[PDB]
Design a binder for this molecule. Sequence first.
Ligand SMILES: [Mn+2]
Length: 192
Amino acid sequence: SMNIYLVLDGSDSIGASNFTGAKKSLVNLIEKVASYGVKPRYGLVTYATYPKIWVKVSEADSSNADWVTKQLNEINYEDHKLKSGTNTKKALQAVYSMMSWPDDVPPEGWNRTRHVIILMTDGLHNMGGDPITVIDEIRDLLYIGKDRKNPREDYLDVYVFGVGPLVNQVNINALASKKDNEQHVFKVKDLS
Ligand SMILES: [Mn+2]
């Protein structure tokens, strides 16, 4: 069981060209995943001053790669309001909300689901504060890094793809998972 959360920064800093490139990379990612005969539930979020959720993992067709690829392609760089701000913390809270439990208790089989966040940004957040705190809140909800004998690090992966020529590499690096002999930081020019 796997959930893949696609989060695409749609703020002005990104630029139409690079945003179009990012979308194309997410389309190829979805096809590369499906080429393995696996069916994750997808979440799709774009953001600037505020986030917009296009697809929730709980939706019926969230595991239909064709349908997901279709909702993605229909997103336009202009389709976002206040692009003059970048609140990455709010975008990750959108992912957190998507992980929320329906009945106050962990859902059946919750400990078996792998969560993979794919964040495309230049790391230039400028509103909302440090987004790392939300990653910590997600790890708490998923009971990752809590039990010293069952850390469950395999159940969360945060990949970050740097977009554009102007990126804050320190911030991008701070958000990506850091796992021995594994790489989680990439550029659009470069899975799940
Ligand atoms: Mn920005």
